[PDB]
Amino acid sequence: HMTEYKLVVVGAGGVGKSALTIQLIQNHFVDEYDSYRKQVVIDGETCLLDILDTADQYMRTGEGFLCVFAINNTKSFEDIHHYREQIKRVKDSEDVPMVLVGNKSDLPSRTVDTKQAQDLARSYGIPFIETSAKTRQGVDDAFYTLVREIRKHKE
């Protein structure tokens, strides 16, 4: 009686992958710190999210990917290319359900601008969502949007 969606959260160390997950799961922001399950209704469908917060089973059986960089970490952003190439290789396709997420939007020290991010997502043909795990801005949006991307690609 529920649809399972297998989601994988990728990106460089320190960008907020766990923080984003833990917000989704626990509704709490963790300052300092596997697989998680969340039941949630999305467009009137009851979904069981199965979320791997990384750092290979999930890499090959993942249905959709959150590719996360932090907006005050230029290197994280530049590393998106590597994660996305990884995903394309291990799924052997050039259109895998993916959302580009730019986290830590609450922070003032911003070195990747929103134009950079929009241009990257536009090149890849994917949504870009700005988030803060600290304030919860964008968090449900990113996960819900990924679900909707997965639905878009297949039954």
Ligand X SMILES: Nc1nc2c(ncn2[C@@H]2O[C@H](COP(=O)(O)OP(=O)(O)OP(O)(O)=S)[C@@H](O)[C@H]2O)c(=O)[nH]1
- Chain positions contacting ligand X, by CB under 6 A: 13-19, 31-33, 55, 103-104, 106-107, 132-134
Nearest-CB residue for Mg ion: 18
Nearer to ligand X, 93 or 135 (CB): 135
CA distance linking residue 118 with residue 127, whole number of Å: 8
Minimum gap (Å) between residue 43 Cβ and Mg ion = 29
Report, in Å, the least distance between residue 86 CB and ligand X: 14
- 37, amino acid identity: R
* Min CB(155)–ligand X separation in Å: 32
Contact 153, 97 (CB under 8 A): yes
| Signed CA dihedral, 149, 144, 22, 131: sign only | positive
- Residue 84 binds which one of Mg ion, ligand X, none, with CB within 5 to 8 A depending on kind? none
Q: Tell the smallest beta-carbon distance from residue 24 to Mg ion (Å).
A: 14
What is the distance in angstroms between the CA of the first residue and the CA of the last residue of the chain? 16
* Closer residue to ligand X, CB minimum distance, 37 or 153: 37
Residue nearest ligand X by beta-carbon distance: 16
Q: What angle do CA 63, 97, 66 make, to 5 degrees?
A: 85
User: Contact residues for Mg ion (CB under 5 A)?
Assistant: 18
Closest C-alpha among 104, 98, 97 to residue 137: 104
